[PDB]
Amino acid sequence: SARSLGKGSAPPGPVPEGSIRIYSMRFCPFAERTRLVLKAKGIRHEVININLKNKPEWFFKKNPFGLVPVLENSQGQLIYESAITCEYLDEAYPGKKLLPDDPYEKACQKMILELFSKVPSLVGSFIRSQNKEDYAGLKEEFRKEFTKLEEVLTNKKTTFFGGNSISMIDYLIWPWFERLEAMKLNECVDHTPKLKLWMAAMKEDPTVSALLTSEKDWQGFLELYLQNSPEACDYGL
Amino acid sequence: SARSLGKGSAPPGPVPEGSIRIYSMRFCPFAERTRLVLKAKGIRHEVININLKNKPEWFFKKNPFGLVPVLENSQGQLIYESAITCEYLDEAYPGKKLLPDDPYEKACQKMILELFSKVPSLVGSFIRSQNKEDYAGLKEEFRKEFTKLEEVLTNKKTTFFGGNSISMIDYLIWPWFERLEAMKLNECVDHTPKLKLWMAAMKEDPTVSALLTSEKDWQGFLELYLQNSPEACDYGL
Ligand SMILES: *SC[C@H](NC(=O)CC[C@H](N)C(=O)O)C(=O)NCC(=O)O
Ligand SMILES: *SC[C@H](NC(=O)CC[C@H](N)C(=O)O)C(=O)NCC(=O)O
């Protein structure tokens, strides 16, 4: 059922009322953001994984850009860009907010995201390293970004980036830290103690824990993906 | 009074109650976003222009990144990143909202901004053109981005990107269109009729009209700026 839909597949039917659909990919960190928010808020939904290495033409009808995540509701409304989909889920569904109601406090989570916005691009450049030298230079680049984040916690003195309770901002940046390990880039959070504790507190989170992927699974996915295999997204099936 | 503060200047005192301060630069399009929102919502504020070519060390205490815009309120709270400052102003101050209350409708303005996010970087690359050839190639790049925007209006069939009434999203992208002219890049909106009408409807806006800068002024600023003159930001004084 978790199997992806690729070229030649038939476009899905309408989203049933009382449920929201997310076009995803099991190993995509941007879509994990959305899925983490979906679990945290206990929102009923269905998932359609997209074969990003061999995607269905009808998908661009879902997102002009052709990327995941993408949400589709019963009214047929489509929303793309992970952060937008997340902010949307927090506003449109019941439950405790993941984002503060307070303007300044909310703007802070936004500024922290800006602070981290460089990591996803670094992770891409990293996964493409070749020798110990490229590697060393990549570790220093991640190192500079990790300090920007440690200062926030340093200043705040709270467990999570938005307070003592986990919130939107934590879920938004977590996926990339989740892969830190499998990517052999942990000796980058050594000089950043609090950030390292944060990673430990996050893994203890029920929502985070329920969606956490195995290193062997991500390792298998990356092998195929880096090879451009139309089977990558379905690693493990 | 509009004169900028540069290296050696003294850090400003507290922001008086009932007023919000914006660290700006008269020719910065990102800060114009904030200033447009400030005018539209009729928010009392003071402006401190920053000499970006020769900025005061104390400013990094305002924004770690060292860029404008940046808002500072009486409680001493600092908020950076133009879009964040704008969203903040809409939520924290009285008046008609510039952003919709409806989650999906709000997410749409956000998706349109994503759609335009490539322009600011193109404008930078453009202002750095040298010959008619670079120029021609730049016109085609802007051309592709303008169509993405014309389709939205095409689909919506409304005057402005968020409806028949101007709203947040219009103000967010306007500054770059404002400079289109002075940058000799108008023959890019020819193949995009509706977008061209939008530009005309925007210039008719009282808020937009009150903050619109002269072509000769921006031309003068750019001459100095491109030269890295510590006087650029103060062109005209
Ligand atoms: S993780 C898989 C890719 N998704 C994104 O890059 C999402 C980026 C957006 N800016 C966001 O949602 O935040 C993806 O769909 N790749 C397909 C491709 O061909 O690029
Ligand atoms: S327009 C002058 C520059 N501002 C920005 O680039 C703001 C970019 C942010 N992403 C935003 O507010 O949206 C600026 O301050 N330049 C100074 C410099 O030295 O770069």
Report the 10 Å Cβ neighbour count for A127.
15
Query: Which residue of chain A is at minimal alpha-carbon distance from B108?
Result: A79
Let me know if B86 is a catalytic residue.
Answer: no
Residues in CB range of A224: below 8 A, 6 or more apart: A231, A232, A235
Distance, CA of B77 to CA of A122 (rounded, Å)? 31
**CA-based nearest residue to A87, from B163, B170, B106, B169:** B106
Task: Report the Cα–Cα distance between both ends of chain A, in Å, rounded.
Answer: 9
Render the burial of A203-216: b for 16+ CB within 10 Å, e for the rest. Answer: eebebbeebebeee
Look up residue B129 and give its DSSP letter.
-
Nearest C-alpha of chain A: how many angstroms from B84?
6
User: Which structure tokens are listed for A58?
Assistant: 């009808």
For chain A, how many residues are written? Answer: 237
**CA-based nearest residue to A7, from A45, A51, A38:** A51
Residues in CB range of B121: below 8 A, 6 or more apart: none
Q: Tell me which long-range contacts B6-10 makes (C-beta under 8 A, separation of at least 24).
A: B6/B50, B6/B51, B6/B53, B6/B54, B6/B55, B6/B56, B6/B230, B7/B51, B7/B54, B7/B55, B7/B56, B7/B57, B8/B56, B9/B56, B9/B58
Query: Which residue of chain A is at minimal alpha-carbon distance from B70?
Result: A111
Q: Is A68 in the pocket of ligand 1 (CB under 6 A)?
A: yes
Distance, CA of B76 to CA of A24 (rounded, Å)? 42
Q: Tell me which long-range contacts B153-158 makes (C-beta under 8 A, separation of at least 24).
A: B153/B194, B153/B195, B153/B198, B154/B194
Distance, CA of B206 to CA of B210 (rounded, Å)? 6
Report the 10 Å Cβ neighbour count for B194.
18
**Phi-psi category of residue A43: left, alpha or beta, with phi > 0 → left and psi -120 to 50 → alpha:** beta
- Indicate which ligand has the atom closest to the C-alpha of A63: 1
Report yes or no: A30 at the B interface, CB cutoff 8 Å: no
User: Which structure tokens are listed for A70?
Assistant: 């993408």
Report yes or no: A124 at the B interface, CB cutoff 8 Å: no
**For the residues of chain A, what is the DSSP string, one character each?**
----B-TTPPPP-PPPTT-EEEEE-TT-HHHHHHHHHHHHTT--EEEEEB-TTS--GGGGGT-TT--S-EEEETT--EEESHHHHHHHHHHHS-SS-SS-SSHHHHHHHHHHHHHHTTHHHHHHHHTT--SHHHHHHHHHHHHHHHHHHHHHHHHH-SSBTTBSS--HHHHHHHHHHHHHTTTT-GGGSSS-HHHHHHHHHHHT-HHHHHHPPPHHHHHHHHHHHHHT-TTGGGTT-
The residue to which tokens 């005057």 are assigned:
B159
Q: Are A59 and A16 in contact (CB under 8 A)?
A: no
Q: Are B146 and B189 in contact (CB under 8 A)?
A: yes
Nearest C-alpha of chain B: how many angstroms from A79?
7
Task: Report the Cα–Cα distance between both ends of chain B, in Å, rounded.
Answer: 9
Residue B114 is nearest to which of A81, A104, A106, comparing CB atoms? A81
Count H helices and E strands in chain B, helices first. 9, 4
Q: Are A212 and A202 in contact (CB under 8 A)?
A: no
Q: Which domains does chain B have, with CATH numbers?
A: 1-98+214-237 (3.40.30.10), 99-213 (1.20.1050.10)
**Phi-psi category of residue A95: left, alpha or beta, with phi > 0 → left and psi -120 to 50 → alpha:** left
Contacts of A87 in chain B (CB under 8 A): 107, 110
Report yes or no: B77 at the A interface, CB cutoff 8 Å: yes
